[PDB]
Amino acid sequence: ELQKLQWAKQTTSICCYCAVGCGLIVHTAKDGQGRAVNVEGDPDHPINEGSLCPKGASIFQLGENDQRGTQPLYRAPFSDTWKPVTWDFALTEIAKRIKKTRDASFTEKNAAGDLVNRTEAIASFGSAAMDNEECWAYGNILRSLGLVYIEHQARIXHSPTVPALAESFGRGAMTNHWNDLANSDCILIMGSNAAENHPIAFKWVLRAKDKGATLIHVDPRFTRTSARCDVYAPIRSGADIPFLGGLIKYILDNKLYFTDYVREYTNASLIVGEKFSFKDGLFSGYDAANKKYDKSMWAFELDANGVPKRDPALKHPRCVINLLKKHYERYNLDKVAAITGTSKEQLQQVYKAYAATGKPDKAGTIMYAMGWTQHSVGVQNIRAMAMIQLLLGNIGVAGGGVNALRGESNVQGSTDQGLLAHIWPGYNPVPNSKAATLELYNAATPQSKDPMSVNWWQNRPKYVASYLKALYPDEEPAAAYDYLPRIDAGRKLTDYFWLNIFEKMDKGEFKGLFAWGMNPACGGANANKNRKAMGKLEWLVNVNLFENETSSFWKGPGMNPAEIGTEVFFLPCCVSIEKEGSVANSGRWMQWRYRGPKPYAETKPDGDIMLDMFKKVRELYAKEGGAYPAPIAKLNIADWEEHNEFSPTKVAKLMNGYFLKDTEVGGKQFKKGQQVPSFAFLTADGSTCSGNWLHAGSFTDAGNLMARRDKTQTPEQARIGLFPNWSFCWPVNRRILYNRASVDKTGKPWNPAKAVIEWKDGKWVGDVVDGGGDPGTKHPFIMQTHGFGALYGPGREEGPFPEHYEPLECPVSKNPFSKQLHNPVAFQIEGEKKAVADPRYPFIGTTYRVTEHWQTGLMTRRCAWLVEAEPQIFCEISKELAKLRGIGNGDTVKVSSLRGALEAVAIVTERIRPFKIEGVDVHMVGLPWHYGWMVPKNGGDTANLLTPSAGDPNTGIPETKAFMVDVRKVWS
Amino acid sequence: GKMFFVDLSRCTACRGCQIACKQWKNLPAEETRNTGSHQNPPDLSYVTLKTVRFTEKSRKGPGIDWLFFPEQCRHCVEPPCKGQADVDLEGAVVKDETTGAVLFTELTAKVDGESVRSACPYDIPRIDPVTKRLSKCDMCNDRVQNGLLPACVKTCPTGTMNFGDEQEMLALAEKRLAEVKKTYPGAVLGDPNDVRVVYLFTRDPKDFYEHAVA
Ligand SMILES: Nc1nc2c(c(=O)[nH]1)N[C@H]1C(S)=C(S)[C@@H](COP(=O)(O)OP(=O)(O)OC[C@H]3O[C@@H](n4cnc5c(=O)[nH]c(N)nc54)[C@H](O)[C@@H]3O)O[C@H]1N2
Ligand SMILES: Nc1nc2c(c(=O)[nH]1)N[C@H]1C(S)=C(S)[C@@H](COP(=O)(O)OP(=O)(O)OC[C@H]3O[C@@H](n4cnc5c(=O)[nH]c(N)nc54)[C@H](O)[C@@H]3O)O[C@H]1N2
Ligand code: SF4
Ligand code: SF4
Ligand code: SF4
Ligand code: SF4
Ligand SMILES: [Cl-]
Ligand SMILES: [Cl-]
Ligand SMILES: [S]
């Protein structure tokens, strides 16, 4: 027996860092009664098999960390010191501040006279770091208080993936899962540094390569990923659409597309209306004065039955696939090479290797993340790759898909729970001010008259009614609908998102902010604006593991505490191994984890903090009365607690849902109190509650399916690694989305050796089928109104096809693709200066991660083994730029933009080379964003001092991956 | 006895192994600074038994050869370190003949530490300036005695790290060398008949580290 592990109890957990979702084994002293003594990998877990990267391997140091918060701290207005306070003081006073601010700001009706019942003077940020049950409860607390400004990591992360992939396929999530990568014939890693940022993924990537896959890395930098790939090609930051449109042209010109898949399963055959056109970089319907498109100009031509017209011959000039060929004909190799910097030879090599996967018995996959999302064209970057995958028949297949790699351990779950301003849990839209009734809300859902179109969102009334019953079980759904706040129908949606929240805050329009498990003083683009704007708050509640740049922004760089009136409450929460609950990984696997040690010192799990705070608000309303108290007073919080604490188990069962009365549904009889077995059995009439329809099926009368640790598989399942009995994925355990597209009209797989589903002896075997129906009876994309993979996607803010636009700060003021330089509807704030081919800021700036740190480094800058490996902010530059500026390797340099400046250590490397753009060498400056002024000594500050608060018009994500800077040697 | 086979053709320099070694032993961190490299700590030391060394070599066309070397004691079949320690005081360096581990004891404080380091053809031993004790990788010998993998082998995400009985591990090393040579024609095993940590280098081992091989 090992001395180290003697008299220690073993429990399982899931890594608190990235969305791979690796399993842990925790040992806790004194048979569970003491501190953690050891944290390492779970050998039985099917994803990591005991492996951990340096972040997972250091969780012991994170949890058992003498720098962790111990109890609440209070910073009075104009004070330079924290005062330790009790939980009771902190939460009593926070309840007073919430209520004072709500009672003064609450609006029953908007200026138009429409009911909105909202509090506009409080915002909340966070958090993908909380458990799923905590995320769900948190969003419901905030909406009961009337908030609409509710955001988190997702906004500044994978927000553009959701509309990009929902436009394309019907859903926003990663389509496949980590184990499935080993099934791929060609893995393109592009806009991702997976060997550093999803390290255990490389177990499965390299297994693909062992079985004959080609691995391709396309990145402005040569990284630790590039070192292990077969093909490495550079690409200039912000030049993805040229590269991807060139591959569309290549596939169409060479007839490398999967003809039958494209004809049957994509919208290739649909006829676009005569009002659609594109000229000189603008689609039809551009309103120059309002910087907006009239998207009605992009509509399909409809038949007399109101179904889009189709030409199965693919001959009509207005067929999607003919308009697609016409759009991408400009993307020839010479023009793509000239704008990307990528040689024609390397473009041909990558295009040939990847487009080879258009064969039915071959599968290509894309692994992407922030290199694609964090742009003013983030949605369109992703759309272009979704279109490629559809042309090649890679959607729905093993080893294929769009592997949009989620970031935080539960950013999939926090998005699923609606911690974004535009969505309730389960991707039901937040009502706008014109949806005056639940009937008017439901009438917005598109209907189909195509009998082969499943159009599954027609079930939305069941999900919204069951959600309103989860919150307000005593009320009819139509009555409860009036409790929840509404956004103004008249406004751009981006007015409600992260960047505009900070702009409003800088104008003094917010009294209070919750920084709940986020560090916006470091993680938000244009961090100088953020740090200044937080001093215009009356109060800030920061919930986090350590004191940090956000909690303590009032004593940050250049700040005078004596001039800053913001009252701050710092509330220390528990680490992941100190609580129970679920996290949803990038493949939508909802995994249950257990407590090892008790909470450190006087720290609390987020669920208890938010429930105790909310109960204090409810008690204060009982004492005083106030603004429209009903939504607060009536909220069903009985179901969230057991033994006077937050109950992960009870909240998870409520999220799944249960029957409030005896009900007959799907000709089955259910009893009051039974769990809902799946979302198929939810009702619109108030019989069922379900906090989140996607969770209906996760926690049934059979028990907690998220807690399953069964690696049992049928032969067909084990051939591709579905592990359907390991945890539970939404929706209803469909591990590979869109898997009806993986079979022909008879239900035979395109690629039998890697079948996902297969029609055998009158049933679908393998994965859970994504949409019920016999073979050939339904279009395969069941969440799409029309049923098809969309090559042409007319719901996007800057058009139905991707088109190259330069980054909003760019090295050239020419675009060879068209007259249009920038995204003509981009999110931007008037007055904010942009460096466009400015010789004062002549270098491309981009920001990215290293294996050893996490996020803003709030967590990992406290972990001595990770600081040891990567102690300081660095600046990566080529030898050629180093020579131009007289910078030696290891020298101190100053990187500057229009918005800020910071010092870093130069890393001079051949891993970065010039980008030859129209014959002219363009130099880049790379920075990590893991550093901040609080800790460690000489670590440096945030790269977000440099980044622009401007970006994608669809989702408001900032362009943190492509801006402009200068670099200069520091002589000190 | 046991053996590591370390397939450096699979290494992503994640440093999982570097952190896992410290977590298992509860080792302290060094004071480090960035001097123009991801590599850190820059060297083995009394508190650092494994560091991943990073070396960049120019290659024609885009990209480089980025060579990663997770350095540790090689657990020599016949360790010179022990021969030298034994000149000053026996019992400073002992062998586990079941596992093959070579093990430093606290009696290293009473031998000439610089001479013991000089005797190592891999330049592995490191001396504590305060106590004069020597440290290095101890093969996670107590884990191995208890039927577990070494911490750095268990943690590795890529199949770079492999551990098992010497006959199976040398057969695996020769099989993998033949396969990797299809892509990396200068691939070689490091001193495979002399050591219990057998590295597969993708090119001249001295490009990975000056003391990569004897
Ligand atoms: N080690 C580590 N892992 C993490 C995290 C972490 O902090 N540390 N954070 C987690 C989170 S929240 C997320 S969202 C994921 C993000 O994971 P990634 O997206 O992998 O993260 P980054 O390193 O920011 O960006 C990936 C790559 O984009 C490249 N790049 C820069 N500009 C461009 C461009 O315009 N186009 C293209 N094609 N590439 C470009 C960069 O050089 C970089 O190598 O990582 C998660 N995992
Ligand atoms: N320049 C630039 N900026 C970026 C990015 C980039 O690539 N470049 N990446 C963007 C992306 S993808 C993301 S996701 C964001 C991240 O931005 P933030 O979310 O602000 O980053 P952090 O706060 O560092 O990381 C998440 C927080 O979760 C906290 N936490 C951990 N466990 C718990 C818990 O149980 N409860 C609570 N309440 N808190 C907990 C951690 O302590 C940590 O502070 O940054 C974005 N910003
Ligand atoms: S950070 Fe990601 S890859 Fe690393 S151990 Fe955690 S879940 Fe696994
Ligand atoms: S854990 Fe494995 S892949 Fe990571 S650096 Fe160590 S040997 Fe290389
Ligand atoms: S075998 Fe054990 S002591 Fe040696 S490097 Fe690996 S973790 Fe460290
Ligand atoms: S590598 Fe050096 S320290 Fe390790 S056993 Fe061999 S001679 Fe001794
Ligand atoms: Cl203080
Ligand atoms: Cl030893
Ligand atoms: S994230």
Ligand SMILES: [W+6]
């Ligand atoms: W993220």
